[PDB]
Amino acid sequence: GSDLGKKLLEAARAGQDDEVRILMANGADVNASDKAGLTPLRLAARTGHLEIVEVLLKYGADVNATDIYGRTPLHLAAGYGHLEIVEVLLKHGADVNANDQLGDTPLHLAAHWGHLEIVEVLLKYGADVNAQDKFGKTAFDISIDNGNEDLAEILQKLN
Template identity: 35%
Template sequence: MEEQLQGEANDLLPLERQLHEATRRNDIRRMKELIGRRVNIRARNHVGRVALHWAAGAGHEQAVRLLLEHEAAVDDEDAFGMNALLLSAWFGHLRILQILVNSGAKIHCENKLGRTAFHRAAEHGQLDALDFLVGSGCDHSVKDKVL
């Protein structure tokens, strides 16, 4: 984790780095304080991750809502083509998937390997996420690019 934070130090301003850290910890109070100071919530770390990626991947519902209320871009991708929807599907955060879809996230997104949210959820046995994705119109017949 320390190496990860050192890498981020090179790409983020100190307050932006603090926002990423607060988001990972689900420290809503600190996130609100930083957002109130007009910290760029769309600031990217060394791999293109934004605060919303951390919140969605960790299943932090309040953090996701807070970031979306302050105009976080719901479909921002990192350097690997991962967005908040793909991360939440991967880790089976059903409530986060619902929030993201209701906020306009593209259900038919894929990462650089052609893996969709459906692929990510299936690969990790996230059955509730799979049910939700199929019910939301996710195409489960799409093939990824991996042999």
């Protein structure tokens, strides 16, 4: 909730798997929000802690919690190259086409990271490969601009 909530946020970003399980068992608020409004699931998603993501989702974490800038746990899992977290979030209903404040979707961020398997999963779940962000960039443009030549080559075939 509050005291347990603070500890839960810290355990999520610290990667302390069983402290998370213990805090959840003792009634911690699964959607406790830090000063920036970020939830344990968002912190575990960006840090790549798969077991913690799975435990939080089991306790009903809001898979599409969105910050004031429009970012979601799926944005951060795709943006930091965390394939199995991307897979589990999508399996639990994460919004594949969520736009942040710049109009970027998780696919745009996965393209920037150059993660082919994350790109694949996002497309399987219905990502729009032709989506443009607010500055007019597609996933293909992003991959080209970053020098992710392999990905750009493949994405060009879906243009």
